[PDB]
Amino acid sequence: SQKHLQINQTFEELRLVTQDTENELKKLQQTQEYFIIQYQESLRIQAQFAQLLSPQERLSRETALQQKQVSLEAWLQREAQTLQQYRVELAEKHQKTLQLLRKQQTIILDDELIQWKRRQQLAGNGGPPEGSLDVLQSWCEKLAEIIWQNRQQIRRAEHLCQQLPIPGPVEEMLAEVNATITDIISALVTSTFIIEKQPPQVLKTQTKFAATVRLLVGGKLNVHMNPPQVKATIISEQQAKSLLKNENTRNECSGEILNNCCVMEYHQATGTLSAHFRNMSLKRIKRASVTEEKFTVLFESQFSVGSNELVFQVKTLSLPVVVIVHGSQDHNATATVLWDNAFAEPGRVPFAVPDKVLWPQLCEALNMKFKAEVQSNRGLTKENLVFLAQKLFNNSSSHLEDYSGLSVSWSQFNRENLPGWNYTFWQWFDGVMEVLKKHHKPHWNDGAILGFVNKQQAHDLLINKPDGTFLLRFSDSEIGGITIAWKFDSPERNLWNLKPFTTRDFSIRSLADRLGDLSYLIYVFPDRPKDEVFSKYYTPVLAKAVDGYVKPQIK
């Protein structure tokens, strides 16, 4: 809460200086109002002379009014300069608080909001949750409360100058203040239309999906009065670039969305103005690989603040989505999305990503997604990272630090196949998460699957162990396969690599049941016995009702 306390201090100073300008604005209006009354007195003074007639009294009444006329005329002249001075002083104070406001806004919007948004982007790859927008709304409320007060303050100060003009520096001073105000409100309004909950980045046609679009300055401006409509629209990466550059053909889009319209709702209790699209669906998609084609859901809205004097057109784009029609296309779709959420640079043109990235950056991305997919805190160890670097780079080294300067290209990750294989690194890696996720989630968590060791590594671990000591390994030759490697002293071969099982095999008999059937397996690596690790998962054979068993019995 270091920068958090400085943000709060600046907000508190901003409200104190805005009350000062308000006090001085009412004071200026009083000064001007009295000056207008004193000016009428100087008019009555001449009308008093006009009511002339005997110079025995008319010589004394003429001198009384002359002395009075002069003093009031002198007071008026001095008060006019005071009116101009206090006016300049107010504009200077408004210019000062607006410059401070600009700095305070840049902090909330270009830093804290971007950090929240990035936190949300990385959460797509199974990263840590971004958290509630409560803090960001609390600040955007104050930003709006303050810019709106100063705006109405200057509109009032301007009204005074209309009713009593005094030419000088004040005109261009107010022209500057106004330009600053439109810049700040436009920025505050356009930037605070954000997507609280993103749509699915791997989207299947004809599948119900949801999104949430919040407006952080909803409660503090006159926006909830007429809650605006938001129109969800699916567009392509090219269409997204031209939408930003403004070189578009108005309604250019790439498909229909069912229930693509929603009206923002204000929740008094929380102060939130937000469109909840709960029943969206992709009816059709226009496509000019399918897997590498990035789309985005564009949310538009049009609304005003206070009166039709201030109207805005807001547009927010979702994180890139990949559309799949089969479901079987998910394998490679996840890879392009995984790359996007991880390696996207801030302030990029629509869905631009780096061609190559350094190996430890890709390590973060794989570890993050891996833990999320298997639903465990046991991630990829330093040894596991080396195993994958050996596989990926086709390098011998067993030192993670060696790979640190190397670069994985997109084609090296999920386009060109591995050395002697018919699959890519992503296909191999995703294959492992997929077999681990469907089944073996508790097994992976309980450490029973060592997995990321090559055929040689497993032998150079099991040799010095008793007959029947095994380890569970990931097959190289078969995507999503698990191989049992075990040492058992015998003629011309001591280490044994059993045939790899895939999800089809597990669907017939579980990993635990299959291990329990094989008597030649007795000790899971390193010491712990087989039944000690898999007794939990052996199937208690249940009697069938068809065989005449009225109550559930365990044979």
Ligand X SMILES: CN(C)C(=O)CCN(C(=O)[C@@H]1CCCN1C(=O)[C@@H](NC(=O)c1cc2cc(C(F)(F)P(=O)(O)O)ccc2s1)C(C)(C)C)c1ccc(Br)cc1
Nearer to ligand X, 127 or 481 (CB): 481
* Member of 476, 495, 503, 538 binding ligand X (CB under 6 A): 476
Helix (H) or strand (E) holding 508: helix 503-508
In one-letter notation, the amino acid at residue 431 is G
Least CB distance from residue 500 to ligand X, whole Å?
5
| Phi and psi based region of residue 206 (left: phi greater than 0; alpha: psi -120 to 50; beta: remaining) | left
* Member of 114, 135, 164, 498 binding ligand X (CB under 6 A): 498
Three-class SS state of 234: strand
Q: For ligand X, how many residues bind (rule: CB under 6 A)?
A: 15
Nearer to ligand X, 259 or 503 (CB): 503
Nearest to 392 by CA among 414, 429, 425: 425
Nearest to 121 by CA among 344, 450, 410, 328: 344
478 binds ligand X (CB under 6 A): yes
Nearer to ligand X, 216 or 482 (CB): 482
Least CB distance from residue 394 to ligand X, whole Å?
15
Q: What is the DSSP string of 498-542?
A: PPPB-HHHHHHS-HHHHHHH-TT--EESSS-BHHHHHGGGS--PB
501 binds ligand X (CB under 6 A): yes
In one-letter notation, the amino acid at residue 214 is R
Q: Which stretch binds ligand X (CB under 6 A): 305-313, 409-417, 431-439, 469-477?
A: 469-477
Query: Could you give the C-alpha distances from 330 to 244, 336, 475, in angstroms and in order?
Result: 29, 10, 22
Q: Which stretch binds ligand X (CB under 6 A): 177-185, 259-267, 370-378, 473-481?
A: 473-481
- Measure the CA–CA gap between 190 and 163, rounded to whole angstroms: 35
Backbone angles phi, psi at 139, to 5 degrees: -75, -45
Nearer to ligand X, 177 or 511 (CB): 511
Nearer to ligand X, 22 or 478 (CB): 478
490 binds ligand X (CB under 6 A): no
- Measure the CA–CA gap between 502 and 549, rounded to whole angstroms: 34
Nearer to ligand X, 17 or 515 (CB): 515
* Member of 496, 513, 522, 538 binding ligand X (CB under 6 A): 496
Binding mask 513-552 for ligand X (x = CB under 6 A): -x--x-----------------------------------
Environment class of 232 (CB within 10 Å of its CB; exposed 0-12, middle 13-18, buried 19+): buried
Nearer to ligand X, 66 or 490 (CB): 490
Q: What's the CA angle centered on 440, arms 552 and 448, to 5 degrees?
A: 110
- Measure the CA–CA gap between 469 and 458, rounded to whole angstroms: 11
Report the site for ligand X in 418-457 (rule: CB under 6 A): 455
Which parts of 274-399 fold into alpha helices (H)? 330-343, 359-374, 382-393
What tokens appear for 15 in the block?
């409200």
505 binds ligand X (CB under 6 A): yes
Least CB distance from residue 504 to ligand X, whole Å?
9
Least CB distance from residue 485 to ligand X, whole Å?
8
- Measure the CA–CA gap between 60 and 41, rounded to whole angstroms: 20
Q: Which stretch binds ligand X (CB under 6 A): 255-263, 288-296, 358-366, 490-498?
A: 490-498
24 binds ligand X (CB under 6 A): no
150 binds ligand X (CB under 6 A): no
Residues that bind ligand X (CB under 6 A): 455, 475-478, 483, 496-501, 505, 514, 517
